[PDB]
């Protein structure tokens, strides 16, 4: 269950800006952070974890200052490094607490889709394929030791402390099981004597699922799974397919294995 703090900073020009954040614990979104709000919105009844209201106000202040500072920094770097707008900046920081002592952390920042730099040990280190101006910005960024120190204890101390808290308060919600409903259909036939068999599976929590076409006990090699697409409710949807000749359609079935299915897999024949 890793914590991923996502940041999306849009800079249309020298005036217009919009930096929005959001946080995920595992597959569930725990926090929301809109450019309009001065507060970090908690989406789950346990999003504050074990942190007291005072601790939570202190962290809230850090992000408030971070947001303001980061924006004036990108703007100052645009002028200094002579970079043209629009600019798209994303920051992906966080950690994962391992059972039952260790915990690794990360802080990656990307520019115009591709990675540019990340915090490594005590300082900002650039990616190998980063543009030569990133090296020039690291020179400025690393000079400020106060931020290099503030990021360092927040990732090594506060992130794991927070994760441990969220895991304790949200345990039940993170361990919840929602049974999926599955049904079959006839896909668009790409051949005159060929039919694409389709297996629909939706409403399953958590995300990990195994949906594969079967003859009997024997697996189907040509099983083409889809993307595990999300629902409005924190559930998911999958659509596994298999292209076979009209005569081979008889006897074929599709097995579905899910943590909610208490051993009893959904076996739907054609």
């Amino acid at each position, epitope marked *: 269950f890793p914590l991923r703090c996502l940041q999306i900073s849009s800079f249309a020009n020298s005036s217009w800006t919009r930096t929005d954040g959001l946080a995920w614990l595992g597959e569930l979104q725990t926090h929301s952070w809109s450019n309009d709000s001065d507060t970090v919105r908690s989406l789950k009844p346990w999003s504050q974890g074990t942190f007291s209201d005072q601790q939570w106000e*202190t962290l809230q202040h850090i992000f408030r*200052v971070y947001r303001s500072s980061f924006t004036r920094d990108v703007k100052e770097f645009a002028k200094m490094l002579r970079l043209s707008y629009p600019l798209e900046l994303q920051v992906s920081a966080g950690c994962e607490v391992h059972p039952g002592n260790a915990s690794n952390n990360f802080f990656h920042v990307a520019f115009q889709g591709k990675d540019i730099l990340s915090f490594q040990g005590t300082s900002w280190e650039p990616t190998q394929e980063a543009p030569l101006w990133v090296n020039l910005a690291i020179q400025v960024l690393n000079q400020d*030791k106060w931020t290099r120190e503030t990021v360092q204890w927040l990732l090594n101390g506060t992130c794991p402390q927070f994760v441990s808290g969220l895991l304790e308060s949200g345990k039940s919600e993170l361990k919840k099981q929602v049974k999926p409903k599955a049904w079959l259909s006839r896909g668009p036939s790409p051949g005159p004597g060929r039919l694409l068999l389709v297996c629909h599976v939706s409403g399953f929590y958590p995300k990990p699922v195994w949906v594969k076409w079967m003859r009997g006990e024997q697996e189907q090699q040509g099983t083409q799974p889809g993307d595990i697409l999300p629902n409005a409710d924190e559930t998911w949807y999958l659509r596994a397919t298999l292209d076979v000749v009209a005569g081979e359609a008889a006897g074929l079935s599709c097995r579905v294995k899910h943590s909610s299915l208490e051993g009893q897999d959904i076996v739907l024949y054609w």
Partner: T-cell receptor
Framework: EQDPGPLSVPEGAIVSLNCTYSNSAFQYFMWYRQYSRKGPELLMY????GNKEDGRFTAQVDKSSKYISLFIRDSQPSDSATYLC??????????????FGDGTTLTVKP | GVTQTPKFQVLKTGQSMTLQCAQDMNHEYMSWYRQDPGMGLRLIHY???????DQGEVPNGYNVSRSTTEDFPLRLLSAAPSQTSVYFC???????????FGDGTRLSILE
């Protein structure tokens, strides 16, 4: 996280005033001076492990040994005052806000 | 800097007293400390921003308000000889940055 009682040092001698914060995880460390009938006045502020010079004042920090210190080289009788230390950064001690030590009174004989 | 009002005050027991505090530095955080021989600096109340106040170490007998982000007045409802002290106002940019202290206020509560 505190410091001890009274000290009397003669003129032009190196004064060692220290604070210990075991067991807490502070990140930013302050030093203050307070004269009789006056308010506290910030001497030095340091966030990184090691020493920082500012005239006759050296502020040494050890995040590993969890102890900080202030050294006054060739101390003048002007320095006779109370020396208060405060520490921040520990999200578990006063949710990050600074924690003040009791204070050390110093008298520099002319 | 920080300028607290008044510098000195002599009052009788069970009498209301609001000692004012100003800050022009545009600091978010503001605090009230009291200093007695032995115990040193004890936090009474603190404000992290406008319209937000919380208890300190010794918050009993005192009231605080943060209507604006410049003024943080300390109020004593029924002043007692237990509150005969030296009061300090302190403002800070953030919870980790160093504080800027006022010149202090001496309070004399007489029966």
């Amino acid at each position: 996280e505190q410091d001890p009682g009274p000290l009397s040092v003669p003129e032009g001698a190196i004064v060692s005033l220290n604070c210990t914060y075991s067991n807490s995880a502070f990140q930013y460390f302050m030093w203050y001076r307070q004269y009789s009938r006056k308010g506290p006045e910030l001497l030095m502020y340091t966030y990184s492990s090691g020493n920082k010079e500012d005239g006759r004042f050296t502020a040494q920090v050890d995040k590993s040994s969890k102890y900080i210190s202030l050294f006054i080289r060739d101390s003048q009788p002007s320095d006779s005052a109370t020396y208060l230390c405060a520490m921040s950064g520990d999200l578990n001690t006063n949710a990050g806000k600074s924690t003040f030590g009791d204070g050390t009174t110093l008298t520099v004989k002319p | 800097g920080v300028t607290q009002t008044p510098k000195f005050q002599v009052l009788k027991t069970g009498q209301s007293m609001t000692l004012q505090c100003a800050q022009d530095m545009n600091h978010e955080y503001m605090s009230w400390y009291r200093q007695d021989p032995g115990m040193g600096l004890r936090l009474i109340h603190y404000s992290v921003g406008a319209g937000i106040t919380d208890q300190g170490e010794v918050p009993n007998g005192y009231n605080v308000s943060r209507s604006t982000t410049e003024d943080f007045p300390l109020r004593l409802l029924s002043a007692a000889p237990s509150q005969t002290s030296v009061y300090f106002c302190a403002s800070s940019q953030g919870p980790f940055q160093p504080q800027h202290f006022g010149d202090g206020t001496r309070l004399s509560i007489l029966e």
